[PDB]
From Swiss-Prot, chain A:
Induction: Expressed in the late phase of the viral replicative cycle. The lineage of its organism: Viruses, Duplodnaviria, Heunggongvirae, Uroviricota, Caudoviricetes. This is Baseplate wedge protein gp10. It is found in: Virion. It comes from the Viruses. It comes from Enterobacteria phage T4 (Bacteriophage T4). The chain holds residues 1 to 76 of 602 of the full protein. Belongs to the T4likevirus baseplate wedge protein gp10 family. Homotrimer; disulfide-linked. Heteromultimer with gp7; a gp10 molecule is disulfide-linked to gp7 and the other two remaining gp10 molecules form a disulfide bond. The gp10 trimer interacts with gp11 trimer and with the short tail fiber (STF) composed of the gp12 trimer. Part of the baseplate macromolecular complex which consists of gp5, gp5.4, gp27 (central spike complex); gp6, gp25, gp53 (inner baseplate); gp7, gp8 (intermediate baseplate); gp9, gp10, gp11, gp12 (peripheral); gp48 and gp54 (proximal region of the tail tube). Peripheral baseplate protein that is part of the tail fiber network. Connects the short tail fibers to the baseplate. During infection, the baseplate undergoes a conformational change from a dome-shaped to a star-shaped structure. At this point, gp10 rotates and acts as a lever that unfolds the short tail fibers, which then interact with host cell surface receptors. Involved in the tail assembly.
From Swiss-Prot, chain B:
The chain holds residues 886 to 934 of 1032 of the full protein. Heterotrimer with gp6; assembles as a (gp6)2-gp7 heterotrimeric molecule. The (gp6)2-gp7 heterotrimeric molecule further interacts with gp25 and gp53. The gp25-(gp6)2-gp7 module is involved in sheath contraction. Interacts with gp8. Binds to gp10 homotrimer; disulfide-linked. Heteromultimer with gp10; a gp10 molecule is disulfide-linked to gp7 and the other two remaining gp10 molecules form a disulfide bond. Belongs to the T4likevirus baseplate wedge protein gp7 family. It is found in: Virion. Intermediate/inner baseplate protein. The gp25-(gp6)2-gp7 module is involved in sheath contraction. Involved in the tail assembly. It comes from Enterobacteria phage T4 (Bacteriophage T4). The gene is 7. This is Baseplate wedge protein gp7.
Length: 76, 49
């Protein structure tokens, strides 16, 4: 999303730094990049990861990707 | 002179426990602590070596 803030003086002693105020910033990042996938969770990166377990209900729901049933036997 | 007079025993321990319980010393030490509110410091001290 290419809009993110890096929080204030970065280095050493100084009188410069952010007022504890930063977290407000660091608060926003996690917001924004959570609003990245608002509900979304792709399987594709992990897509085959999950289902290997037996008879998996394997809820990916409301958002997520899940499954293989890789070795099968799964009746998945 | 007309009564039976038999002897029997009883024992009384009188355990004295309850000495001490002196609470010793109570000790408390204050903290400067850190919350995300924070805000402007006044100068600084120490902070590294």
């Amino acid at each position: 999303m290419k809009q993110n803030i890096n929080i204030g003086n970065v280095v050493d002693d100084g009188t410069g730094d952010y007022l504890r105020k930063g977290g407000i910033k660091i608060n926003e990042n996690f917001d924004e990049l959570y609003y990245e996938l608002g509900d979304g969770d792709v399987p594709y990166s992990a897509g085959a990861w999950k289902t290997y377990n037996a008879s998996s209900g394997q809820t990916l729901t409301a958002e997520w990707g899940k499954s293989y049933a890789i070795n099968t036997s799964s009746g998945r | 002179v007309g009564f039976g007079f038999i002897a029997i025993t009883l024992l009384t321990m009188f355990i004295n426990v309850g000495l001490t319980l002196k609470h010793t010393e109570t000790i408390i030490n204050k903290y400067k602590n850190y919350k995300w509110d924070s805000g402007l410091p006044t100068e600084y001290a120490d902070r590294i070596a």
